[PDB]
Paper text:
Ribosomes are conserved in all kingdoms of life: they are composed of rRNA and proteins unequally distributed among two asymmetric subunits (small and large subunits, 30S and 50S, respectively in bacteria). Ribosomes perform protein synthesis upon subunit association and interaction with mRNA and tRNA ligands; their structure and function strongly depend on the presence of divalent (mainly Mg2+, Zn2+) and monovalent (mainly K+, NH4+) cations. We reinvestigated the structure of the Thermus thermophilus 70S ribosome in two different functional states, modeling the initiation stage (further referred to as initiation complex or IC) and elongation stage (further referred to as elongation complex or EC) of translation. Here we demonstrate experimental identification and localization of potassium ions within the full 70S ribosome structure using diffraction data collected at long wavelengths, below (λ = 3.542 Å, E = 3.5 keV) and above (λ = 3.351 Å, E = 3.7 keV) the potassium K absorption edge.
The second K+ ion interacts with the mRNA in the A-site and helps orienting the third codon base for proper base pairing with anticodon residue 34 (consequently, it was identified only in the EC). This ion is coordinated to the nucleotide (+6) of mRNA (third position of the A-codon), C518 and G530 in anti conformation. The coordination has bi-capped square antiprismatic geometry with coordination number 10. In our structure of the EC, we have localized a K+ ion in the P/E kink, which appears to be coordinated through its solvent shell according to the distances in the pocket. Previously, this ion, which participates in the network of contacts formed between the ms2i6A37 modification in the P site tRNAPhe and ribosomal elements surrounding the mRNA P/E kink, resulting in the anchoring of P-site tRNA, was assigned as magnesium. In the EC, two Mg2+ and three K+ ions stabilize the P-tRNA, while three Mg2+ ions are found in the IC.
Author numbering:
A (entry chain 11): 2 to 273
B (entry chain P8): 1 to 49
Amino acid sequence: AVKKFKPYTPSRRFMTVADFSEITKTEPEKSLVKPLKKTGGRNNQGRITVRFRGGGHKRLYRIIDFKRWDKVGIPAKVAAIEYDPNRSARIALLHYVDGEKRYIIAPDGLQVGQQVVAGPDAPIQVGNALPLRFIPVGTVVHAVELEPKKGAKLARAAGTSAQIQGREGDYVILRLPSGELRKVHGECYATVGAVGNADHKNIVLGKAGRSRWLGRRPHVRGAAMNPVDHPHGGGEGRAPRGRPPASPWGWQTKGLKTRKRRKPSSRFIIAR
Amino acid sequence: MKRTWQPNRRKRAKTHGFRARMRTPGGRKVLKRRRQKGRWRLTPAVRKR
RNA sequence: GUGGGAGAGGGUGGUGGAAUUCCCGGAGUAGCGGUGAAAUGCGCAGAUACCGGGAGGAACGCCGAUGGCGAAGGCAGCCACCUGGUCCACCCGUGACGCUGAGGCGCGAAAGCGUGGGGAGCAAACCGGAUUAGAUACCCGGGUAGUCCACGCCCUAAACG
RNA sequence: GCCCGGAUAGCUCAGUCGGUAGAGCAGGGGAUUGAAAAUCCCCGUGUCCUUGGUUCGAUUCCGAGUCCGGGCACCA
RNA sequence: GUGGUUCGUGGAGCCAUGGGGGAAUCUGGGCGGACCACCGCCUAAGGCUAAGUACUCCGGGUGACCGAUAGCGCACCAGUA
RNA sequence: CGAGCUAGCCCUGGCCAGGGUGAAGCUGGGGUGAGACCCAGUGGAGGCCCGAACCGGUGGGGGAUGCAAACCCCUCGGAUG
RNA sequence: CGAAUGCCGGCAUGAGUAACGAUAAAGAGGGUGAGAAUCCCUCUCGCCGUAAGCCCAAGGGUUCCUACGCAAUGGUCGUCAGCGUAGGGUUAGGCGGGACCUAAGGUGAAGCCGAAAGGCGUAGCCGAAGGGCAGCCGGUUAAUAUUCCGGCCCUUCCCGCAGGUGCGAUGGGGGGACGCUCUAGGCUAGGGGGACCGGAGCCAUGGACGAGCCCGGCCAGAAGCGCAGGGUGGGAGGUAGGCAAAUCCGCCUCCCAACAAGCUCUGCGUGGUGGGGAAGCCCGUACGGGUGACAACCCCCCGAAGCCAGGGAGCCAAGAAAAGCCUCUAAGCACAACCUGCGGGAACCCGUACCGCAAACCGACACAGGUGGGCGGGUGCAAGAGCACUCAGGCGCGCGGGAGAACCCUCGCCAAGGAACUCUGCAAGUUGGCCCCGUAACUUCGGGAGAAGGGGUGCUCCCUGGGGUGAUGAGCCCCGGGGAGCCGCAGUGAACAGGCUCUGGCGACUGUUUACCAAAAACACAGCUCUCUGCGAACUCGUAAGAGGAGGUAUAGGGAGCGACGCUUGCCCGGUGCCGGAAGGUCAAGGGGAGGGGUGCAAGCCCCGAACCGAAGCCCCGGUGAACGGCGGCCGUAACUAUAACGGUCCUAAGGUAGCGAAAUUCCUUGUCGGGUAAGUUCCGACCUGCACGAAAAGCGUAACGACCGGAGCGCUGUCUCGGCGAGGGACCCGGUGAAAUUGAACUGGCCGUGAAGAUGCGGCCUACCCGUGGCAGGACGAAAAGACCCCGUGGAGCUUUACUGCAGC
RNA sequence: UCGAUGUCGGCUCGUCGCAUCCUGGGGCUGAAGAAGGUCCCAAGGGUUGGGCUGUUCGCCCAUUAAAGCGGCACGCGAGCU
Ligand SMILES: [K+]
Ligand SMILES: [K+]
Ligand SMILES: [K+]
Ligand SMILES: [K+]
Ligand SMILES: [K+]
Ligand SMILES: [K+]
Ligand SMILES: [K+]
Ligand SMILES: [K+]
Ligand SMILES: [K+]
Ligand SMILES: [K+]
Ligand SMILES: [K+]
Ligand SMILES: [K+]
Ligand SMILES: [K+]
Ligand SMILES: [K+]
Ligand SMILES: [K+]
Ligand SMILES: [K+]
Ligand SMILES: [K+]
Ligand SMILES: [K+]
Ligand SMILES: [K+]
Ligand SMILES: [K+]
Ligand SMILES: [K+]
Ligand SMILES: [K+]
Ligand SMILES: [K+]
Ligand SMILES: [K+]
Ligand SMILES: [K+]
Ligand SMILES: [K+]
Ligand SMILES: [K+]
Ligand SMILES: [K+]
Ligand SMILES: [K+]
Ligand SMILES: [K+]
Ligand SMILES: [K+]
Ligand SMILES: [K+]
Ligand SMILES: [K+]
Ligand SMILES: [K+]
Ligand SMILES: [K+]
Ligand SMILES: [K+]
Ligand SMILES: [K+]
Ligand SMILES: [K+]
Ligand SMILES: [K+]
Ligand SMILES: [K+]
Ligand SMILES: [K+]
Ligand SMILES: [K+]
Ligand SMILES: [K+]
Ligand SMILES: [K+]
Ligand SMILES: [K+]
Ligand SMILES: [K+]
Ligand SMILES: [K+]
Ligand SMILES: [K+]
Ligand SMILES: [K+]
Ligand SMILES: [K+]
Ligand SMILES: [K+]
Ligand SMILES: [K+]
Ligand SMILES: [K+]
Ligand SMILES: [K+]
Ligand SMILES: [K+]
Ligand SMILES: [K+]
Ligand SMILES: [K+]
Ligand SMILES: [Mg+2]
Ligand SMILES: [Mg+2]
Ligand SMILES: [Mg+2]
Ligand SMILES: [Mg+2]
Ligand SMILES: [Mg+2]
Ligand SMILES: [Mg+2]
Ligand SMILES: [Mg+2]
Ligand SMILES: [Mg+2]
Ligand SMILES: [Mg+2]
Ligand SMILES: [Mg+2]
Ligand SMILES: [Mg+2]
Ligand SMILES: [Mg+2]
Ligand SMILES: [Mg+2]
Ligand SMILES: [Mg+2]
Ligand SMILES: [Mg+2]
Ligand SMILES: [Mg+2]
Ligand SMILES: [Mg+2]
Ligand SMILES: [Mg+2]
Ligand SMILES: [Mg+2]
Ligand SMILES: [Mg+2]
Ligand SMILES: [Mg+2]
Ligand SMILES: [Mg+2]
Ligand SMILES: [Mg+2]
Ligand SMILES: [Mg+2]
Ligand SMILES: [Mg+2]
Ligand SMILES: [Mg+2]
Ligand SMILES: [Mg+2]
Ligand SMILES: [Mg+2]
Ligand SMILES: [Mg+2]
Ligand SMILES: [Mg+2]
Ligand SMILES: [Mg+2]
Ligand SMILES: [Mg+2]
Ligand SMILES: [Mg+2]
Ligand SMILES: [Mg+2]
Ligand SMILES: [Mg+2]
Ligand SMILES: [Mg+2]
Ligand SMILES: [Mg+2]
Ligand SMILES: [Mg+2]
Ligand SMILES: [Mg+2]
Ligand SMILES: [Mg+2]
Ligand SMILES: [Mg+2]
Ligand SMILES: [Mg+2]
Ligand SMILES: [Mg+2]
Ligand SMILES: [Mg+2]
Ligand SMILES: [Mg+2]
Ligand SMILES: [Mg+2]
Ligand SMILES: [Mg+2]
Ligand SMILES: [Mg+2]
Ligand SMILES: [Mg+2]
Ligand SMILES: [Mg+2]
Ligand SMILES: [Mg+2]
Ligand SMILES: [Mg+2]
Ligand SMILES: [Mg+2]
Ligand SMILES: [Mg+2]
Ligand SMILES: [Mg+2]
Ligand SMILES: [Mg+2]
Ligand SMILES: [Mg+2]
Ligand SMILES: [Mg+2]
Ligand SMILES: [Mg+2]
Ligand SMILES: [Mg+2]
Ligand SMILES: [Mg+2]
Ligand SMILES: [Mg+2]
Ligand SMILES: [Mg+2]
Ligand SMILES: [Mg+2]
Ligand SMILES: [Mg+2]
Ligand SMILES: [Mg+2]
Ligand SMILES: [Mg+2]
Ligand SMILES: [Mg+2]
Ligand SMILES: [Mg+2]
Ligand SMILES: [Mg+2]
Ligand SMILES: [Mg+2]
Ligand SMILES: [Mg+2]
Ligand SMILES: [Mg+2]
Ligand SMILES: [Mg+2]
Ligand SMILES: [Mg+2]
Ligand SMILES: [Mg+2]
Ligand SMILES: [Mg+2]
Ligand SMILES: [Mg+2]
Ligand SMILES: [Mg+2]
Ligand SMILES: [Mg+2]
Ligand SMILES: [Mg+2]
Ligand SMILES: [Mg+2]
Ligand SMILES: [Mg+2]
Ligand SMILES: [Mg+2]
Ligand SMILES: [Mg+2]
Ligand SMILES: [Mg+2]
Ligand SMILES: [Mg+2]
Ligand SMILES: [Mg+2]
Ligand SMILES: [Mg+2]
Ligand SMILES: [Mg+2]
Ligand SMILES: [Mg+2]
Ligand SMILES: [Mg+2]
Ligand SMILES: [Mg+2]
Ligand SMILES: [Mg+2]
Ligand SMILES: [Mg+2]
Ligand SMILES: [Mg+2]
Ligand SMILES: [Mg+2]
Ligand SMILES: [Mg+2]
Ligand SMILES: [Mg+2]
Ligand SMILES: [Mg+2]
Ligand SMILES: [Mg+2]
Ligand SMILES: [Mg+2]
Ligand SMILES: [Mg+2]
Ligand SMILES: [Mg+2]
Ligand SMILES: [Mg+2]
Ligand SMILES: [Mg+2]
Ligand SMILES: [Mg+2]
Ligand SMILES: [Mg+2]
Ligand SMILES: [Mg+2]
Ligand SMILES: [Mg+2]
Ligand SMILES: [Mg+2]
Ligand SMILES: [Mg+2]
Ligand SMILES: [Mg+2]
Ligand SMILES: [Mg+2]
Ligand SMILES: [Mg+2]
Ligand SMILES: [Mg+2]
Ligand SMILES: [Mg+2]
Ligand SMILES: [Mg+2]
Ligand SMILES: [Mg+2]
Ligand SMILES: [Mg+2]
Ligand SMILES: [Mg+2]
Ligand SMILES: [Mg+2]
Ligand SMILES: [Mg+2]
Ligand SMILES: [Mg+2]
Ligand SMILES: [Mg+2]
Ligand SMILES: [Mg+2]
Ligand SMILES: [Mg+2]
Ligand SMILES: [Mg+2]
Ligand SMILES: [Mg+2]
Ligand SMILES: [Mg+2]
Ligand SMILES: [Mg+2]
Ligand SMILES: [Mg+2]
Ligand SMILES: [Mg+2]
Ligand SMILES: [Mg+2]
Ligand SMILES: [Mg+2]
Ligand SMILES: [Mg+2]
Ligand SMILES: [Mg+2]
Ligand SMILES: [Mg+2]
Ligand SMILES: [Mg+2]
Ligand SMILES: [Mg+2]
Ligand SMILES: [Mg+2]
Ligand SMILES: [Mg+2]
Ligand SMILES: [Mg+2]
Ligand SMILES: [Mg+2]
Ligand SMILES: [Mg+2]
Ligand SMILES: [Mg+2]
Ligand SMILES: [Mg+2]
Ligand SMILES: [Mg+2]
Ligand SMILES: [Mg+2]
Ligand SMILES: [Mg+2]
Ligand SMILES: [Mg+2]
Ligand SMILES: [Mg+2]
Ligand SMILES: [Mg+2]
Ligand SMILES: [Mg+2]
Ligand SMILES: [Mg+2]
Ligand SMILES: [Mg+2]
Ligand SMILES: [Mg+2]
Ligand SMILES: [Mg+2]
Ligand SMILES: [Mg+2]
Ligand SMILES: [Mg+2]
Ligand SMILES: [Mg+2]
Ligand SMILES: [Mg+2]
Ligand SMILES: [Mg+2]
Ligand SMILES: [Mg+2]
Ligand SMILES: [Mg+2]
Ligand SMILES: [Mg+2]
Ligand SMILES: [Mg+2]
Ligand SMILES: [Mg+2]
Ligand SMILES: [Mg+2]
């Protein structure tokens, strides 16, 4: 379900906006928002370390809960479902029965009203979070932790999910959004379900400006520069690549693998 | 056109000020030098009030 | 209307085992494939063949029929739910309400097409090996789209009785 | 105009350490067929482009010349 | 592995030391240009030590030094306008 | 030593006369088994249109020891992004 | 010292020359004074008026006011001045900032890093055109005024009274608190009108003594009262959350209440009282005073973009923080404290003049440039900040007088023709607004479209339908509709305001760029593919700490190419890249030491050192094309000829598929044919022999878009035949002021020759009295820049890579 | 001539040569006439307007008495483009 426009302007022909139906609250929960310092892609030296970043709508960080176990066994009521402009996924405002309000990243299905809770107990239901070991094999799950107590860091982007495939001692065999087969510790929490807002991948920004709203300044091809600037700089008209394609920093960029070989997590990966 | 000199009393002192010089060690030599030479003013003259 | 049937009729959601392929483990040695015969291919960097563990997809052996259902196209593992047509019995109810049907509207195999997803087997195109005078074919080794799902198109047929 | 390469059987081409040059196809004579083809058996003609030289001897080595093909003919 | 020394890897010792290994108290240890013997010379891994040496912001004395385009950038209210 | 010019980004403020066009959504009517859709009204979207401010700098003329070390006149581009 | 485009200084030439800095514009009378176009004053004239007026901010820093001055500064003049000399001038509890808050950022206890210097860094602190916070209207000075004075009104601190109540933090919680577009109600600012109120006066020139003309008819105001609107449920129980504790907030369950009310809060009207108060006329002011007056002070209409304001609706890109403030409890204290009234007292530092779209700021200048926010009246024109005029206000641009040439510039008209001009309709025309009618191919269905093309447009009288405000009524507004008629060459009568079409290329589009010769077909762009990247991600900056990535997590992030969209995107993996290969070769330090060597009388001590064990890399084996890349030759053959579907053979990793094709690519070439034209190197359609297209350095198309680039036509025209006239600003003459590059020195002619090969300068001849003014550009191989092309230099720089050697990195 | 001698074409303005394109005069003719041919004298004047291309050139359109060729730094950018 995605919004389209009639072509009453060039660039409305193809523009497409998310259907905002599952959205329930519109202003966010004040006691749960910080201002986020916008970098423009600049590091603590005043120096761009990520090109073509900046501008883009002013935003307000929603502090969201990626460690669910700091409230084991207290249920919560899904109070709202609202837009969070700091991620692709939509956040669920929930209301704990001891009165604490916290932000969850909303799974698919989860509707205003239901109960949610996290702990070893935790019925196997969408919204609930459990140490991985007590999650039925083959369940699809999201917001996984990579190591225990370090907080969810996996399958959080709109429509993502991992699948529990098997177990080996303290480690369960996970299939990540990227098809890769990782062992992950059992005491790693994970809330069950997939992430939802799955149509996300179907919006069509439509015009140069929509990119600009998202903090994305134009991106200029190596081809388009001169050789001071870039390996593909120069030539007379137009120039084939001329060499193994490369980055402004000169490294190969069609194939050249960069994950460090010696990396200790090598031991717990099995895929691609 | 718009020329290059666009006076700003705050910018002038933030940038060439005595305090500014004494922060960086390069600046303290800039002072060290203007003293050792006799310059009547070590830092540019500005005007807060 | 009332009571009943038979049924691979349709839609949905689940679920089972055989087999193929790939992966890991174990044990094992020089061939395995393939064909008319071959070659290409695969294999001591440990293949084929055998055991165990897993992953994934697609199709449902026996039952099975010259059988059944559907208007047609078509439909076949099993389970539930939702749902269409039909048949019989009984002779209760309406009372000619019937037949057909130009246009309209809906369904409509396969291939194809769009957006996603999926991808084990198979396989247009394509590549090799062969055969031939040539072989842009038939046979062989590989192989993409497609084949599968969802939504939306296309509307064809020896859509045949 | 400038430099590189090539020129061998009818056609397309290997090839040589200086001495007797081959491959496929075409062609020829036989066979098979009713007849052609495909198949099969047997058969090369070559003055190795022209010219001059090196040699005992040159298709083979050398210098030129035709001819063909390829690159170049830039600042102007 | 380097630096220092005349020593640019050279027969490359001596002094120093980032890395590794790692002792002994005089019958101990370092040195005399690889190394060995011999014969000598020294006493590592704690510290201090005037003077003789260098310099001229400052004061003075001199000049086969300048004399206002010279001499300091400045003889004058110049590191100023 | 410089980002008081210029380039980009960050924080916090401000600005854009007046006209046009009339998207979706609504609401009614039609339609149908239900729908799709159709028509009207409302509505007031847009790197939408005309045009000042403002931002520009197309073409032409002028200037060329200039008014001006890039200006002027006519003309033209954007003008809710 | 004679040369170094030498250095410093002086003074010449060009020269009384160019210039005197917007073509808004001047004239006179009077006055002052040694002296006046330039200063004062009056009268007339012109110019600005979304400014060329007025108010803040920044900058500048005495320029402000006055008196006395004119050497210089002023593009002339100067009696004047933004100049000289002196003297005066800037008043705040409420305006701005500070004894308040936080933002990015800066700084920075703790703590981390780094040879040194220093780099980072949670808290804290700093940091504002953001939050917060108490003054409005008049009057007065030569010059300040929300600052002084008047009237009216507030804030905070201290100390009292009285009355309240568990008080009490830097801790908890609420609030503060937030986008963009559209926007209702009710007001206010501001305006227009009045037959009404007030007012000096007026009756001209034919008429008018009129409900005539002219002028004005308000401003501030506490409490309370109204009219608008904002914000907010009330109670009770439970409680594990809000890093202690809460009675607060949060969550739960009860109840009453609920489109309100009530409580608050703000705006607006009113309101004690206070102020203002025209034109005109007379005052002597460079300008202010007197009077007008006991001024009046009312009604109606328009109406904000401002106010009520945290209002409402829609939308996606999802819209600061901290304090002040309210609540809550902790220690501590409750003979404290706080809250509420009302009283007295206390209330500091800094700024304040003037300029401020400009002669005071940035541009070396009294520079036609640049400079942020607010106000910016009236009438008309469909609207408006547009356009014309014009109010308040301000100005005529700090050289003038004449003249009436060329020529230049800006501008107006042109008979006939109408693009014949030319690289090109360059330029200039035409067209222009609003209303109505009407509008094609093609299309992505929105568009194309203002397509095209037409008709209308003023004024007068009669009829007449709606709105708004009043009241349903009058008046005042607004949107109209019908019919008669009038005058001109002309009714958007001035001013502002598209020329149109057809057909190609390129780019889809809006955007972006070479500040200052290129705005584009270039860049970007949604979108598509490839690839890396499992998170202490990859990548980027940094020696490091750290940081960006990202408070993100494969629907995400980096890199590369392609560039909406449609239909597509072929074959080649031999070489190069990348990917995969737990075997094999090779392979450095290391290990290991067969076996030698040097020395010692030996025990030793010290060197070499063969196997063999040794990684990555390379080789090797495979993969890989939206990875770098590549994508053939010759000969023959058909029953007229021609041509070759077909065959033969050499070579290759493989031999270019669809589409397209003399093209932004085609050399021959103006290819050939067809179309347009009387004529077409261009353009369009074709053909294919593609010198040397061809598929994501994408291929072929594509509606729409374009200050791109091309061909054509229609309209119109001084572009042209081919010029004429005219206006103004210069040029020219006179008065004032007065430069510049350049310059060996000059007494500086023509020809034919000669000369280092292009002579004022030599020869011969010929011409020629001395000196200027306006003009033109043939020559002084005229000026200007130590040629920018070319070469040279064992000169330099940017850039490339399978050049060398290295270093970072891996 | 590199301490600079601006370079094609167009425009404008010409001027000179004559080996003459026209006009004028002539000899010869395979000159009946008329029209030509060829060569001689002659430089006084004349020598068009368009399409195409930056073009010079050239080719074409329509004319004409004719539609001359060369030089002057392939005349002329302190004259323009
Ligand atoms: K790009
Ligand atoms: K390029
Ligand atoms: K056969
Ligand atoms: K197969
Ligand atoms: K496949
Ligand atoms: K059938
Ligand atoms: K059948
Ligand atoms: K060969
Ligand atoms: K042969
Ligand atoms: K040494
Ligand atoms: K030692
Ligand atoms: K020694
Ligand atoms: K010694
Ligand atoms: K000492
Ligand atoms: K002197
Ligand atoms: K000096
Ligand atoms: K509508
Ligand atoms: K609109
Ligand atoms: K000199
Ligand atoms: K002079
Ligand atoms: K003037
Ligand atoms: K006005
Ligand atoms: K003077
Ligand atoms: K001046
Ligand atoms: K005087
Ligand atoms: K502030
Ligand atoms: K508090
Ligand atoms: K708070
Ligand atoms: K008023
Ligand atoms: K003041
Ligand atoms: K004159
Ligand atoms: K012409
Ligand atoms: K009325
Ligand atoms: K217009
Ligand atoms: K395209
Ligand atoms: K520049
Ligand atoms: K443009
Ligand atoms: K560009
Ligand atoms: K972050
Ligand atoms: K290849
Ligand atoms: K390869
Ligand atoms: K390969
Ligand atoms: K062609
Ligand atoms: K080509
Ligand atoms: K033609
Ligand atoms: K353009
Ligand atoms: K001249
Ligand atoms: K050399
Ligand atoms: K010269
Ligand atoms: K030269
Ligand atoms: K003649
Ligand atoms: K003549
Ligand atoms: K030509
Ligand atoms: K020349
Ligand atoms: K010129
Ligand atoms: K020229
Ligand atoms: K000249
Ligand atoms: Mg907050
Ligand atoms: Mg810094
Ligand atoms: Mg470029
Ligand atoms: Mg750079
Ligand atoms: Mg490079
Ligand atoms: Mg390149
Ligand atoms: Mg370039
Ligand atoms: Mg190229
Ligand atoms: Mg990967
Ligand atoms: Mg300057
Ligand atoms: Mg001093
Ligand atoms: Mg059934
Ligand atoms: Mg079924
Ligand atoms: Mg195995
Ligand atoms: Mg049934
Ligand atoms: Mg009956
Ligand atoms: Mg009956
Ligand atoms: Mg079908
Ligand atoms: Mg199908
Ligand atoms: Mg698919
Ligand atoms: Mg041959
Ligand atoms: Mg011979
Ligand atoms: Mg050394
Ligand atoms: Mg050496
Ligand atoms: Mg030693
Ligand atoms: Mg020794
Ligand atoms: Mg010795
Ligand atoms: Mg003396
Ligand atoms: Mg001196
Ligand atoms: Mg002297
Ligand atoms: Mg001096
Ligand atoms: Mg700046
Ligand atoms: Mg900046
Ligand atoms: Mg726009
Ligand atoms: Mg404004
Ligand atoms: Mg401005
Ligand atoms: Mg500007
Ligand atoms: Mg311009
Ligand atoms: Mg010009
Ligand atoms: Mg404009
Ligand atoms: Mg516009
Ligand atoms: Mg914006
Ligand atoms: Mg001299
Ligand atoms: Mg002097
Ligand atoms: Mg002097
Ligand atoms: Mg002169
Ligand atoms: Mg003159
Ligand atoms: Mg003059
Ligand atoms: Mg006068
Ligand atoms: Mg006078
Ligand atoms: Mg005026
Ligand atoms: Mg105006
Ligand atoms: Mg003014
Ligand atoms: Mg100031
Ligand atoms: Mg100044
Ligand atoms: Mg003054
Ligand atoms: Mg003077
Ligand atoms: Mg003055
Ligand atoms: Mg003065
Ligand atoms: Mg204050
Ligand atoms: Mg104090
Ligand atoms: Mg603070
Ligand atoms: Mg710091
Ligand atoms: Mg403030
Ligand atoms: Mg204040
Ligand atoms: Mg006053
Ligand atoms: Mg004043
Ligand atoms: Mg006042
Ligand atoms: Mg309390
Ligand atoms: Mg309103
Ligand atoms: Mg008022
Ligand atoms: Mg009005
Ligand atoms: Mg009035
Ligand atoms: Mg009276
Ligand atoms: Mg009279
Ligand atoms: Mg009267
Ligand atoms: Mg009267
Ligand atoms: Mg009032
Ligand atoms: Mg009031
Ligand atoms: Mg309540
Ligand atoms: Mg309680
Ligand atoms: Mg607590
Ligand atoms: Mg209320
Ligand atoms: Mg009085
Ligand atoms: Mg609101
Ligand atoms: Mg604070
Ligand atoms: Mg003031
Ligand atoms: Mg002024
Ligand atoms: Mg002012
Ligand atoms: Mg202003
Ligand atoms: Mg002024
Ligand atoms: Mg002024
Ligand atoms: Mg002014
Ligand atoms: Mg002036
Ligand atoms: Mg100015
Ligand atoms: Mg100035
Ligand atoms: Mg105005
Ligand atoms: Mg107004
Ligand atoms: Mg107006
Ligand atoms: Mg108008
Ligand atoms: Mg006036
Ligand atoms: Mg002016
Ligand atoms: Mg003037
Ligand atoms: Mg005319
Ligand atoms: Mg005419
Ligand atoms: Mg005409
Ligand atoms: Mg023409
Ligand atoms: Mg034009
Ligand atoms: Mg007009
Ligand atoms: Mg048409
Ligand atoms: Mg339309
Ligand atoms: Mg129209
Ligand atoms: Mg029209
Ligand atoms: Mg009329
Ligand atoms: Mg009239
Ligand atoms: Mg073309
Ligand atoms: Mg474009
Ligand atoms: Mg536009
Ligand atoms: Mg554009
Ligand atoms: Mg430029
Ligand atoms: Mg440039
Ligand atoms: Mg620009
Ligand atoms: Mg430049
Ligand atoms: Mg230009
Ligand atoms: Mg330009
Ligand atoms: Mg980090
Ligand atoms: Mg990306
Ligand atoms: Mg990217
Ligand atoms: Mg591109
Ligand atoms: Mg490898
Ligand atoms: Mg090995
Ligand atoms: Mg070794
Ligand atoms: Mg060893
Ligand atoms: Mg290796
Ligand atoms: Mg290989
Ligand atoms: Mg390709
Ligand atoms: Mg033609
Ligand atoms: Mg042309
Ligand atoms: Mg290409
Ligand atoms: Mg390609
Ligand atoms: Mg392209
Ligand atoms: Mg094309
Ligand atoms: Mg197109
Ligand atoms: Mg003319
Ligand atoms: Mg004239
Ligand atoms: Mg005139
Ligand atoms: Mg003169
Ligand atoms: Mg004069
Ligand atoms: Mg000179
Ligand atoms: Mg001569
Ligand atoms: Mg002589
Ligand atoms: Mg002579
Ligand atoms: Mg003269
Ligand atoms: Mg010259
Ligand atoms: Mg030179
Ligand atoms: Mg030069
Ligand atoms: Mg240059
Ligand atoms: Mg060199
Ligand atoms: Mg060199
Ligand atoms: Mg010279
Ligand atoms: Mg002659
Ligand atoms: Mg005759
Ligand atoms: Mg002549
Ligand atoms: Mg002549
Ligand atoms: Mg002609
Ligand atoms: Mg020549
Ligand atoms: Mg010549
Ligand atoms: Mg020439
Ligand atoms: Mg000339």
